[PDB]
Write a protein that binds this ligand. Structure first.
Ligand SMILES: O=C(N[C@@H](COc1ccc2[nH]c(=O)[nH]c2c1)c1ccccc1)c1cccn(Cc2ccc(F)c(F)c2)c1=O
Length: 277
């Protein structure tokens, strides 16, 4: 049974959807956690506060090596506290910024872990809706840990959530999001690992939505050819035609794409990740 003073609170790690996430070390153990802090004053009708407003949440307990996990809960007079996994190596976006772009072996390995993670998440009937490199964290061992910041939803129009660069055309034009929306976001992320920047770029968010809906993007000359082929099979306007979706026979043909030829799917979490250089 813990409380605020078993901990030293340190740097802010993230924010959003009514809460702050703070690095904290447990004094007895020296162990480090990311503590989501939520002010009780925020818990009202006009607000959708994540994880608290939900009758049923099966996300709270999500427990898989490629996702952030919940370790403990406690409260004080004004706030609630949720002890989450701390991903010591920060955001994948930070490595894309540091090294400019990833080589093919690193793109293949990290893309396969995101695919693996998605397969699991979608098999649990959950969709993320805001998948992007800022939400793909790296633990101390350099494996991914995906985080939700309030957009993930159990499948039982849809809320206008997400980040403009990664949002699907079906969310924009049909108000709908499905498993296949996170597969569109996976195509933007693969592009961004290879090219160094995401594929839909424009002067403002409205202009970026216009490029998404028209499929206006291009590949640099050096983009790895099998990766270009995979991205072309994910960035398809018709959501029922993306590789990986149920109507395309599911995750088997996505994992069987030539870009993943030397991948061993079964044990990615037990493989030593390639050095990022
Ligand atoms: O509470 C969970 N996530 C937090 C964010 O947690 C963070 C944020 C940054 C950090 N940096 C770091 O090192 N550790 C950090 C932890 C949240 C905040 C605000 C609203 C909603 C959620 C949270 C609680 C339980 C499980 N998961 C993982 C998850 C659930 C559903 C999904 F679809 C999914 F893809 C993943 C959480 O993200």
């Amino acid at each position: 049974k813990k409380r605020p003073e078993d901990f030293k609170f340190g740097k802010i790690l993230g924010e959003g959807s009514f809460s702050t996430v703070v690095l904290a070390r447990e004094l007895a153990t020296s162990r480090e956690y990311a503590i989501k802090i939520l002010e009780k004053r925020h818990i009202i009708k006009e607000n959708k506060v994540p994880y608290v407003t939900r009758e049923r949440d099966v996300m709270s307990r999500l427990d898989h090596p490629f996702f952030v996990k919940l370790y403990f809960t406690f409260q004080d007079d004004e706030k609630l506290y949720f002890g989450l996994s701390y991903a010591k190596n920060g955001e994948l976006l930070k490595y894309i910024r540091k090294i400019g772009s990833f080589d093919e072996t690193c793109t293949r390995f990290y893309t396969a872990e995101i695919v693996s993670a998605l397969e699991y998440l979608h098999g649990k009937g959950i969709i993320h809706r805001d998948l992007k490199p800022e939400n793909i964290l790296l633990n101390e061992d350099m494996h991914i840990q995906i985080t939700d910041f309030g957009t993930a939803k159990v499948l039982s129009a849809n809320s206008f959530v997400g980040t403009a660069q990664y949002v699907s055309p079906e969310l924009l034009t049909e108000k709908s999001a499905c498993k296949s929306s996170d597969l569109w976001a996976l195509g933007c992320i693969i592009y961004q690992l290879v090219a160094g920047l995401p594929p839909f770029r424009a002067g403002n968010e409205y202009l970026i939505f216009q490029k998404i809906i028209k499929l206006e993007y291009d590949f640099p000359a050096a983009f790895f050819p099998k990766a270009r082929d995979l991205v072309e099979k994910l960035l398809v306007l018709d959501a029922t035609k993306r590789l990986g979706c149920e109507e395309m026979e599911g995750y088997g043909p996505l994992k069987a794409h030539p870009f993943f030829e030397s991948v061993t799917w079964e044990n990615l979490h037990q493989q030593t990740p390639p050095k990022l250089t």
